[PDB]
RNA sequence: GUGGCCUAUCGAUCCUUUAGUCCCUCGGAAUUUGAGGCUAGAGGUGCCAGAAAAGUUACCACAGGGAUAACUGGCUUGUGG
RNA sequence: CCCUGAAAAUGGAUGGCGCUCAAGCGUGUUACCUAUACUCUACCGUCAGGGUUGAUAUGAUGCCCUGACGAGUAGGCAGGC
RNA sequence: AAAUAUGUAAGAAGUCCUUGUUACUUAAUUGAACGUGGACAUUUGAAUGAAGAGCUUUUAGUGGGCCAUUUUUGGUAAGCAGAACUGGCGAUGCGGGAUGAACCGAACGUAGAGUUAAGGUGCCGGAAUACACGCUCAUCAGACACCACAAAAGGUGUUAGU
RNA sequence: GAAUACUGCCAGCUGGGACUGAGGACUGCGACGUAAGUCAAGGAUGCUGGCAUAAUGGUUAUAUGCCGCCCGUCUUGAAACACGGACCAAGGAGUCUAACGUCUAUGCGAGUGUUUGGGUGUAAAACCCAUACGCGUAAUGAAAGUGAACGUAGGUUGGGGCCUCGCAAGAGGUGCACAAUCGACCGAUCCUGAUGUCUUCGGAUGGAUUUGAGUAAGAGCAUAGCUGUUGGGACCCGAAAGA
């Protein structure tokens, strides 16, 4: 709200806060990104290191759902399950009937491993497993299943 | 309504007053002040007046009968402050004065509704001025030209200085 | 310290004080320096609970700490607030202050003049 | 002279209690008597000017 | 006039009373003003001065950040105080039993510590148990682990991240960052 | 709450400093110096007339 | 001993080019040309932190400047007297 | 010390009047005069350190105790009209 | 070869005594670096002060300067131009220098009282036509720093002196 | 053999003058008194007089004493022989928006955001909601790609608070945040190159004065506010020009 701003507290201040000498004026050092190169290069070198020239290969036409992969770890592998059969499942850590997470229908493309779920078999359905994800499945008495 | 109201008031009892450390010790007069001393008034309507000084009263006033007989001045109290002592003395051991004092000379309680658009003395009081002024008379007498100066009013005359005077 | 006061001769006027000035000087105008804060002396007790670490229980142990420069005179005189005086009630005596002492002025070193000047400045 | 405090500390651990390892600045000269003996004060005033010219 | 030493008038720099106008949070910090005021244990001066702290100044402390903190020697039967809010955590699969006294609890991280066992304590019950601070445990969450920390600082060398919208490819990835490029940083 | 000079207000004088009453009773203040006959040295009195 | 006894003797982005890795990409799938990438040099900006640049206006215009000349005044007095 | 050396333009400047064993020049000793400076006190504000709940006679961003401090363009912030 | 200015140190993250690690080092059970365990008291290793000490974020205005003492360059010089240290003015009133940005004194909330600074005390004008020893008479005397200038040279004017 | 001057000391005495009277039950420190009390001892009381209204006082006009240059602005420097301003009323200049930085408040939190839309309604309000989508929970590389625990998620040094022993001083234990440091892990670069084999694929183990805007028991998402940033007429007014 207006009521607030400085601008009422400059009321009866010849300046408005902007000095006599400098003088507020319209664009003193140029509009935009003038002068990157030239007279605001110490603040380009200083802030934006990086930001002239070219790096890498162009890609034409590229669409982003080919590389849709969001990815997820061992450490939040056991959230897929609904809580309500996840204590159930925890206790008694069998084999025979160990749980299926379906990572895909989950929305993941890739398991990482991040690590140390609790000593107990699951199924891992993934289109893409980490071979450390793998590994620690394994030794929990998983298994991973490759889908598409 | 047409002003809010103040959220707290102030309380209306009266505080009451700490202890005071100041004791009412008699006052120490100065030294030329001693009974019999002859005074000149510098205030009042008996400006520059030559008067007796009788007795030191408990208000701190000076009992003076600069004699009525000679002067007119009748027993009354003055501030020691706008006396003047000088170095003329006369005897008082001859005088009774340990009736006069501050009720003696209450004056009245003069009423507020009591006024006056335009416009006597007590009786005790002349034969009390009559029987101190005998003896101060009697002594008086003795050493002469007391009578007329006493009669005599004090004043000024041009060149004096009452820095270097000798009262 | 000498070489302190030879530093900052020209804005000072020091020398050498004697018993009758200190005893002065801290009865008159002797603060001390509690939590930050200047409290009048004013009472032995001040003195023992801020100073009695250091067998100092009075304003007499204090002045003797200062006048005999005791084993604690560094927290006695750190724990007495910085003397306020007024000006010289008989003036400096000079015409012009900002000349030596020894040229006829009023800063350096006065020996036992410095007496007689904090005498009328309190 | 931390080896020195040391040795100090050590042997005030003794004998001589509070050794008073921390220096001190110089101090004011203490009291002293001046003898006349063979030394009678006798010197002379300022010199004349001369141009030695 | 006075040679001034230092700079007059200033403010001592730190919140003598919270910002918000929260009443609760009010009436927590009139309490701990009173236990701090009235005893002599630092635990309520330190508690005070934390009901005073901004948001960023009180990041939220994980039950696995209890838990572990619980793990130390000596500490499993004591109170856990966050003067903030307790988040639950997935990454852990036991909890131990245990009292955690703090502003808030999320939905999760209440449920996790009463299925544990233990119970989530307001800090006037916690003054109330413990007007001394008695066998408590004051856990203060990653203040530096914030996003905005990452761009403070930034320079050459100082290896910081630009305040940028878009990355990838393009984005401020070529001269200034490579020796190929110019130079690097 | 009002700072009162001891040097004078002798009450206060008295608060502080118990010993002002001794000091004052013995008047140590003038004490009378015992007295002593020694002479200075010819060779000091010939110094200081020296020209 | 990682150039010249030491203190000077030199050059970004884009583009071109060469060397290296024989590596990555050409996005429906491969092969071979071609092209594009990654690392390291060169081609040059001497106004040397690096625009691509001839005059004239006595026909002139605008924003300003006493931050700055052409007259008095002021300081100075070499020169002049 | 004084004098000569010593000439500029409207009428004029130990500030003026004037001053001559000075009211001039050198020096010395006192007294005296007065700044928004120093000392003490009151009051305003600011800052700091504290007290105050077996209900503080229901205001604890209130009430109170203590100490110090106060110039200000450009500018910042705060409380208010 | 000064003066002034300038680097470092004056301890606990320290010192000492035993013995642990290493792929470094040594001819070596030698070292180097970092350590376990033990000893050192209150002057824990000069003085003075310390107004709280450290740490971070963010953003305003500014990026024409000028003056004075001292050092100093160009110039005959300049109220000229250009540097060094510090203090100032700018951004600042107040008392004094009549007057004046910068000099002297002193820096400022609103008042009372006392005392002073620099400067003064014939009158203007508050305050000694004070006191004391001398000097000077100018037919163009002199009269307080910054500062509002004076020189070489000369005089049986007058004073003191060699 | 004295005296006096000069200088200095007294917790020696005492006279005159001026300004001030803050606080408001008690609490303290003292002093004098055998005690009882009293006191000049943590800030003024007592007695008395006049008037009770324009008398004091306020306002205003004037007089007197001393002081006081015209504001605004640019400027090292303005009263300036620098510029704007004869006078008065009314109007008259840092705004809104898109995106964003720091900070702060609020909700909920490994999530968070209902308001594109649907439902509903007392109808542009309020209330209710699915699927998606944005940002976040993973980085790194040009890319193909690969992708975060040796260990109580490590060691050392500090570290608030807590715990135990201590009247205390202090000594031990535990030590979050944070700071320094040595390590470990993920990606990039360079090197090494096991079993095996479509004999050219695969890339296990082990390294490095290299490198990243990483991990190492998550902090973020959303709304709002001041301040700051860019594009916009962009604080207001102003060209000579160009089309
Ligand atoms: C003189 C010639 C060309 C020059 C350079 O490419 C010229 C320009 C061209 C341009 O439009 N933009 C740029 O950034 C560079 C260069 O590199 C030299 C070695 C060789
Ligand atoms: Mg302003
Ligand atoms: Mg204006
Ligand atoms: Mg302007
Ligand atoms: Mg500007
Ligand atoms: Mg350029
Ligand atoms: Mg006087
Ligand atoms: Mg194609
Ligand atoms: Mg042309
Ligand atoms: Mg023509
Ligand atoms: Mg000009
Ligand atoms: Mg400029
Ligand atoms: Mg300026
Ligand atoms: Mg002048
Ligand atoms: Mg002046
Ligand atoms: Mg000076
Ligand atoms: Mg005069
Ligand atoms: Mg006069
Ligand atoms: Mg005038
Ligand atoms: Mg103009
Ligand atoms: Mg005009
Ligand atoms: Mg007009
Ligand atoms: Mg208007
Ligand atoms: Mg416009
Ligand atoms: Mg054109």
Redesign the interface.
């Known amino acids: 709200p207006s009521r607030f701003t400085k601008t009422r507290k400059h009321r009866g201040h010849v300046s408005a806060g902007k000095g006599r000498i400098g003088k507020h004026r319209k664009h003193p050092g140029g509009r935009g990104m003038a002068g990157g190169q030239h007279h605001h290069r110490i603040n380009m070198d200083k802030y934006h290191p990086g930001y002239f020239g070219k790096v890498g290969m162009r890609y034409f036409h590229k669409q982003q759902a080919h590389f849709w992969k969001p990815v997820l770890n061992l450490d939040k592998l056991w959230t897929l399950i609904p809580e309500d059969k996840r204590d159930q499942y925890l206790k008694s850590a069998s084999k025979e009937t160990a749980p299926v997470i379906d990572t895909l229908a989950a929305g993941y493309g890739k398991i990482l491993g991040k690590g140390r779920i609790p000593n107990v078999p699951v199924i891992v359905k993934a289109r893409f497993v980490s071979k450390l994800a793998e590994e620690k499945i394994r030794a929990a008495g998983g298994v991973v299943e490759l889908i598409a | 309504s047409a002003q809010k109201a103040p959220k707290w008031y102030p309380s209306e009892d009266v505080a009451a007053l700490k202890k005071t450390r100041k004791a009412a010790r008699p006052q120490k007069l100065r030294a030329s002040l001693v009974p019999g001393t002859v005074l000149i008034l510098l205030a009042g309507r008996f400006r520059g007046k030559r008067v007796v000084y009788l007795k030191h009263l408990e208000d701190n006033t000076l009992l003076i009968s600069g004699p009525f007989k000679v002067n007119g001045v009748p027993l009354r109290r003055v501030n020691a402050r706008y006396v003047i002592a000088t170095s003329t003395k006369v005897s008082v051991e001859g005088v009774n004065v340990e009736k006069f004092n501050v009720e003696y000379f209450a004056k009245e309680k003069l009423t507020k509704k009591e006024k006056k658009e335009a416009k006597e003395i007590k009786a005790e009081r002349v034969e009390d001025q009559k029987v101190v002024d005998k003896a101060l008379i009697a002594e008086i007498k003795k050493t002469p030209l007391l009578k007329q100066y006493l009669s005599a009013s004090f004043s000024l005359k041009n060149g004096d200085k009452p820095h270097m005077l000798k009262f | 310290?000498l070489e302190l006061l030879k530093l900052i001769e020209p804005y000072v006027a020091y020398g050498y004080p004697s018993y009758s000035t200190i005893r002065q000087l801290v009865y008159k105008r002797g603060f001390g320096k509690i939590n930050k804060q200047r409290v009048p002396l004013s009472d032995n007790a001040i003195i023992e609970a801020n100073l009695g670490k250091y067998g100092i229980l009075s304003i007499d142990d204090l002045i003797h700490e200062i006048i005999t420069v005791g084993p604690h005179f560094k927290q006695a005189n750190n724990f007495l607030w910085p003397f306020k005086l007024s000006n010289p009630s008989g003036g400096w005596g000079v015409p012009r202050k900002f000349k030596h002492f020894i040229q006829g002025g009023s800063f350096g070193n006065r020996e036992e003049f410095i007496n007689k000047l904090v005498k009328s400045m309190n | 002279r931390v080896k020195a405090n040391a040795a100090k500390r050590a042997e005030a651990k003794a004998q001589g209690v509070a050794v008073q390892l921390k220096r001190q600045?110089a101090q004011p000269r203490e009291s002293r008597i001046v003898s006349?003996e063979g030394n009678?004060?006798?010197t002379l005033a300022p010199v004349p000017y001369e141009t030695f010219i | 006039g006075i040679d001034h030493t230092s700079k007059q008038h200033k403010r001592s720099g730190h919140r003598t009373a919270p910002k918000s106008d929260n009443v609760y949070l009010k009436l927590l910090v009139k309490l701990y003003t009173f236990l701090a005021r009235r005893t002599d244990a630092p635990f309520n001066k330190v508690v005070l001065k934390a009901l005073f702290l901004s948001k960023i100044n009180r990041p939220p402390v994980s039950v696995s950040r209890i838990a572990r903190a619980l793990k130390q020697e000596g500490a499993a039967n004591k109170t856990v105080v966050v003067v903030g809010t307790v988040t639950d955590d997935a990454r852990i699969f036991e909890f131990p039993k245990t009292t955690v006294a703090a502003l808030r609890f999320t939905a999760g991280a209440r449920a996790k510590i009463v299925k544990a066992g233990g119970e989530c304590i307001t800090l006037d019950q916690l003054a109330v148990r413990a007007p001394k601070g008695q066998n408590t445990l004051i856990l203060r969450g990653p203040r530096n682990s914030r996003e905005a920390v990452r761009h403070f600082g930034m320079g050459p060398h100082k290896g910081k991240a630009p305040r940028i919208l878009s990355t990838g490819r393009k984005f401020e990835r070529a001269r200034g960052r490579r020796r190929s490029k110019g130079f690097k940083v | 709450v009002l700072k009162k000079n001891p040097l004078k207000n002798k009450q206060v004088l008295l608060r502080l400093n118990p010993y002002a009453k001794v000091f004052a009773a013995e008047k140590l203040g003038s004490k009378k110096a015992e007295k002593t006959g020694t002479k200075p040295?010819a060779?000091?009195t010939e110094?200081l007339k020296?020209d």
Do not use: E, G, L
């Open positions: 310290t | 600045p006349t009678v004060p006798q | 040295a060779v000091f110094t020296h």
